[PDB]
Amino acid sequence: TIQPGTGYNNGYFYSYWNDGHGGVTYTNGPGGQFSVNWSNSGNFVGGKGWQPGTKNKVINFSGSYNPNGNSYLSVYGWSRNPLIEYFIVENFGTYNPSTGATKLGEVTSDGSVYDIYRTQRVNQPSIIGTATFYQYWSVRRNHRSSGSVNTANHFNAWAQQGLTLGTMDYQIVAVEGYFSSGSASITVS
Fold it and tell me: Where exactly are the structural domains of the chain?
């Protein structure tokens, strides 16, 4: 594993964060590749991409994703002003992150319909400190672990629905886990 933090590896920005509980390892590989292995973890997020992201990036990803429990695979990032955490969820484990959330529409992109949702985090950690902020979700109906994400289709659909993004901060393909187990090997471009 590598040390939790952010940086660059083989031309790609990476972010790896965990809650210190244990049970997760993250490694950076050649090019845009990263691997995650976890067993009875806490909460963590790790992956590779760009800092800053853009609003018209076509993100390609390929590999394997084998969660056993609560985990997501998504295009993941933030905006500032307004502060927003966003997820284009391509696959997940035992928990659909939109469970109980308000549905804000649908968008068809890259071979599937996605359902759009908005949620709110209240006094939670963020890229600017503790804050209350919205989260935007596109949840893919047809789960997969390779493909291409035309981010503009999502960001445009969100904007149409009144879900405004500010200036982009980082933008990665991320494996997120919450007290679960699994393995993943993903290459980004």
Answer: 1-189
For this structure, is 90 an active site residue?
A: no
The secondary structure of the chain as a DSSP string is ---SEEEEETTEEEEEEE-S-S-EEEEE-STTEEEEEESS--EEEEEEEESS--SS-EEEEEEEEEEESSEEEEEEEEEETTTEEEEEEEEESS--TTTTPEEEEEEEETTEEEEEEEEEEEEE--BTBSEEEEEEEEEESS--SSEEEEHHHHHHHHHHTT----EEEEEEEEEEEES-EEEEEEEE-
Indicate which residue of 110, 115, 169, 176 is catalytic.
176
CATH code that applies to domain 1-189: 2.60.120.180
Q: Is 106 known to be catalytic?
A: no
Q: Which of 48, 75, 85, 157 is catalytic?
A: 85
